[PDB]
Structure formats: structure tokens, C-alpha cells
Amino acid sequence: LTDQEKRRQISIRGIVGVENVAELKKSFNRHLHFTLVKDRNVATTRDYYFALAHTVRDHLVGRWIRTQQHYYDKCPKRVYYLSLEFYMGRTLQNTMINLGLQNACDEAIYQLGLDIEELEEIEEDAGLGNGGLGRLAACFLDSMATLGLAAYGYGIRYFNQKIRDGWQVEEADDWLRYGNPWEKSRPEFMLPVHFYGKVEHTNTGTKWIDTQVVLALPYDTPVPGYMNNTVNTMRLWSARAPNVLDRNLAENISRVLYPFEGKELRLKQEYFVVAATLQDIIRRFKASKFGTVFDAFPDQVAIQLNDTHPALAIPELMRIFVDIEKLPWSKAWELTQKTFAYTNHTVLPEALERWPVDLVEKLLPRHLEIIYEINQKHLDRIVALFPKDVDRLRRMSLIEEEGSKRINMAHLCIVGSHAVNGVAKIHSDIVKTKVFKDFSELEPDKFQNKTNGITPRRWLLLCNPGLAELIAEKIGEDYVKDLSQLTKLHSFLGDDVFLRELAKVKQENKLKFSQFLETEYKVKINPSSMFDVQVKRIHEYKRQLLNCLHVITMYNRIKKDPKKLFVPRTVIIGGKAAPGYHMAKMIIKLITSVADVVNNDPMVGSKLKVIFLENYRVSLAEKVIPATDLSEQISTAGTEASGTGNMKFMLNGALTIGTMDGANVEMAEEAGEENLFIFGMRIDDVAALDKKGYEAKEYYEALPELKLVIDQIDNGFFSPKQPDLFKDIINMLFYHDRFKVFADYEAYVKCQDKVSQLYMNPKAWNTMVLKNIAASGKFSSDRTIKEYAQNIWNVEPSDLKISLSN
């Protein structure tokens, strides 16, 4: 008996769902010996981490198998998140947290006589991010899995900041010298991507010929939802040479993110992601369990364009439909616009992608044609509605026809998407009312806001188990999948007991992070000190230099009368500066030398410490963030759209000091201004000071203490061996400081003094903090996703624990 139900023996029936200790030790031993081809006598700590990661993967995959099985079966509309970069951090713990295996693994690994913490620290950060964008993608991928959406993450598959002589010194990030156990290569799903060549017009549709081919290799990484047994995918592509000296012009496409031919190489990078991706989707949807097959394309596919990097998806989808599936250009266009939605992240108007036609022309000729065609019909519709206005015309035109005419990628994205959104109320308003005024005026509804958010898993359960364990006891464990549940904590604004545990939790995380700075940067760390952190990328606009000014200023208050009640302060400033950014590299040395002084002079002792947090990255943010008291979100008004970091710090018991811009604004709304340290010029206050004109002249003198530091710095005080070294900051401070530092030097320096004041009264602090913590549930990246699903993708969230046994 028994036939080709013999093939039904090929199952995970008895190899999925058994998550006990015996089983975990047994898998661990299988991997360390069989997968790794090692033994207890030859295995380094790295060998053990791997064996443990593999042990965890198996469970992740088990659910990924059932998950994909559910999607094929239910045939849900699918979401595709298209981003150049994905800031993933480390995988292990996160996976153990989401699958609920932390505890068994803890014990499994104790029994084998290994320190799980040691293993967990061997993992390098997946170099797939460089900013807040790659990190927004990563929260979304988490929230989509958790929210039960059939999402996918499409991007590329590619940096160690080190300090030396107080200077930043870039160094290579070999994140894959030993491999990535988390990812799987699908060579069997490779795809050819084409560059260059030419287009041949025939009666049997247009053809692109004589092209240079680059292969696109998919690497899959499982993305686990939180405890619903749901597991999504992040497919990242690598480039390969098909079979003279160009057998690397492929590799280049994938070797560094944010790299003339350095502009070009970026273009090929963007197209490579876009072509491979679209082909992949089309392939997946042609295989769905489900005239014309594509008629339903937009009801089964939603593609999200994170910024203008993958703006080629529009003409590329059109190229596929018309030249390949061969449908009418007008049908393909309706399928297109309904597929795509565009997310604008840049406040800027002078920072949008714009490629020169002559370039798009050589590399992607069939695409330029398609683009010119989208345009004509585009303007053609405009001329209809507004006959005279020849200005609205050339304005709204996808192409900037001038010197060497350029294509406006941002415009292409808008015409080709059914929905455009911003990431904060005021930001989304500028995008609609100003930046793309013309566009909004036309199809007004097309525009909208989706306030950024942050994942409660990585940024609380994982990093701050102290805080989580605490909250849990008071308001149960529903805040995890519903962060607006944190409100219920206000019911403790009185519980003086509570605030005790609370600040205690902050001390513990604050104490641990201490053992770290000492063991790392080797400097006595004042565990009682008020940890004040500013960890944004190193740039002019982000200030930091303004904090430094406040770094030194506090350094004098302890020198001009060394016995006046001063609130102890450990100041942390971390971040990276582009290897080409001359200025910031200087602000980096500046902060270093300054630190040296304020640290070694024994007069200040355990009063104030300065620390440059080297190699700021996801995993580091995970160390600092929980142990921070004051969050430094102080960037000049009208420069920040959102501010993800702002939110991790408010979620974890830190308190915020900053301006009325970006995320601070919506934070004020939920907590209240009183519960936030606002200050400095409002966007309007600056909206005037420019007309008046600005010269650091005034502020310098009138502001005594300013003169101090201001000169201290220049007078070679912090730079003895080269006092004239920072003589480059002063010139672009007085003269060309496009960011008005001094102008706020007032509000700031004083502002802080109210902090030292609130800090001195513990009770005042903790009551305020709890007010910040119980108003952070709105900035959950789950709520941000719910929104996207309703008003954009038209897909519904699910709380269906996928079944392991079926």
C-alpha cells in the first residue's frame, strides 16, 4: 500500500515544534560537529556562536516554511518594500525573543558549559545600512511579520569607524569573512540584468539589444514576527560576472552602499535592485495559486518606493509589461500606478535625485524612451486642464531641460504612484502644500502622512528587559502588540514606589553600560553621573559642535570655582562622518582633544566625563539607549523630517533636550511640552533671523562664557600642539555657518541647567520620565504599519498564530 503520498513523508511533522532543552543541546551538537565540522577541542568561541545560531535558524525556518505555505494557500495580496539599504543589526537574540526561545537556549547553553553572552557578542552587525532609512526598513519588516502581512524586503547585499589621534579612521567591514548563517543563497533563482546596448524598433514591439549582462543572485534572510509563528523574507541581491576587465564592473554594483562613474555606479546599483526585484515579483505572481493574468496585478501586489532610489521600478515595470508581456501601453500604465506608492523622506528640495539624460541615455536607452513617453502623456494632461500656464508645465515636467537636461526622479515617482507620503505631520504637509504644490493641487487625495515609528521588540523587550519586565508587572503584556497600552502607566504617576523601581532599572542598565565604557575606552565611569547622549551621524546640521560648546562650558564652571554644586555628568557623543566630509572630520577631532583635557585634569574628577562612542551601530544603540538619561535631539529647526532615535530614547526612560522640529514636535503633543526640554528658535524664529542676516559677532562678546570656550578652542587651549588646527571651524562658524550655532547657544546652555535641576530631584525626574514613557506608544512601528495597510496597500493585519502542526 502507499503510493506517491510516499512523497508526503517529505515533511517537518516530527522536526518542528519540539523546543525543549534536550532537543536544543542535541541540535547544537549536530551543528557544531556536522554543520561546522569542528569539535569541543578545536572550536573557538566563534565556532560555538555559529552552532548556536544554526540551532536557532532551524526553528526560524520551520515557521518560515509554514508561513510561505500559508501564503501560497491563502493567496493574500503581497507587499514589497523596496529600499537600497536595510539596517539589520544582529539576528540571534532578536530571533530568540520573537520565537520565545531565550529561556531554553539560556539553559541549553549553560549545560554545555558556555557563556551565552560571549556567543551573542561574536556576531558582527550586518553591514546593510548606513542611516535612519535602513533602520526604518528593518523596523517595518519586523512589524509586518508581527502584523501578519505577506511582506518582503528587497534590497542590495553589500565600514568600521575607528578613532586614532582623536581622528576618525575608516576601516574595512568584513562582515562575511566567516559567513552569515542567517542567509541562504538561491543560485537557482539567478536573474540577468542588462545595461547599455541599444533599442531596435520593430513591428513586433521594441527590442533592447547588444546589452552588457550582470547576474543578480538572491540571498534570503528570514524575518520573524513576534510570537505568531509568522516568518517573512528579505531577499537581497548580489552581482556576479556572467562568464574582459569588466568581470568586476558587476561586483562594483554590490560592494559598498553610498559610494562621475561614482554617480554612474550608483545608477547601475539602483537599476540592478529594481530589475532583479520586479522580475522576481512578476515571477512570483505568475506562480500564484490563482483575457489576462495581469488584470489583477495591482490587487495582489503593492510595491513601496522608499525614497527615489528605486524610481526606475516605474519605467522598468512598464518595459516588462509592454515589451515583454506585450500589453497596451495604456493598460500597463493603469497596472503600474496602482502597484506603486512613494515614500518621501527628505525635507530638502535641493537633495532630490536628478540624473542627466545623456547618462540615463547611454546605460538605459529603452528606459529613457519610456520616461519621455510617461512625460508627454503627463504634461499632455496638464495642457488640457491649464492651457495658458506654460510655467506650471516646465515645472511639473519630469525632465529639467537646460544645460545638460536632467530627469527629476522625484517627479517620476509621483506621476507613477497612486499614493505619496511623508513621515511626520509638518513634513508631510510641506511635501504636499509646498514641495509638490502643483502635484497636490491636481490629485489632492494622492498625498498623505504616515508618521514614522519604531519597533517595540528590538527597542524594549530585547535591549531593555529591565524596563519591560517592570512595565509587564504593572500593565500586563499587551503593550507589546499594542504600545498605546503604555498609557495605563499614568495610573502610577503617584506610586512613589513605582518611580523607585523605575529609576532603579535605569541604574542597572546604567551600571552595565558603565562596565562597558571602562572596559572599552578605559576611563573611570561615574555610575551616578547623568548620562547625556547625542548619537546621530556626524554632520554640521546635526549640531554636536553645539553640545561640545556646552561640553567645555561645563568644564569651566568647574574651573572658575571648583566647589560649586555641580550635577555629575558623563557626556556621550557617537557617530560617523563621511570619509570625504572635511568639516565633520574636524568636529570629530575637536570632540576628541576636548575630551582628553576634561578627562585627565583631576580637578574635575568624577564630575564630568566626555566620550566619543566609536563605531555607532545598531547593536551599540542597543547598549547605550537603555542606559541614557538625557537624549540630545538638538538640530537647528526646519532640517529634520522625523527622528527615529528621538523615539527609542523616549521609550526607554531617557528624557529629551531639543528643538521644535522633526520628531520632537509629535513627542511634545503626546507627552506635553512641559515634559520635554524644548528651547532655541522655532522654525519661525529662524524664519526671520535670516532676513536680519546673521554674524556670530554679537553673540561672541555679549555672551561671556561663549567668549571663553569660543576662544579656548581657537586660542589652542584644547589643541596645545596645534592651536591653529581648528582654525578651520571658526572660519565656517563666523563666516559660513549655515546652521546658526551661537544663535541658540543661549537657550541651550540654560536649558541644560534646568535638567541638572530636575535631575537633582529624583522624584521630579521619574514622574516626568514615566510621562514620556507612557506616551511613546504612538511611535510604535506597528501603528505606522497598520496605517500603511489601510490607506495605502489595502491589505489587512492578522493576529493568526500560524500553526506549526497541520
Binding site: Q68, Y71, Y72, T233, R283, R284, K286, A287, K289
Partner: peptide, 4 residues
């Protein structure tokens, strides 16, 4: 055939 199914394409995951």
C-alpha cells in the same frame, strides 16, 4: 509550480 509555487514560487516562494
Amino acid at each position: 509550480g509555487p514560487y516562494y
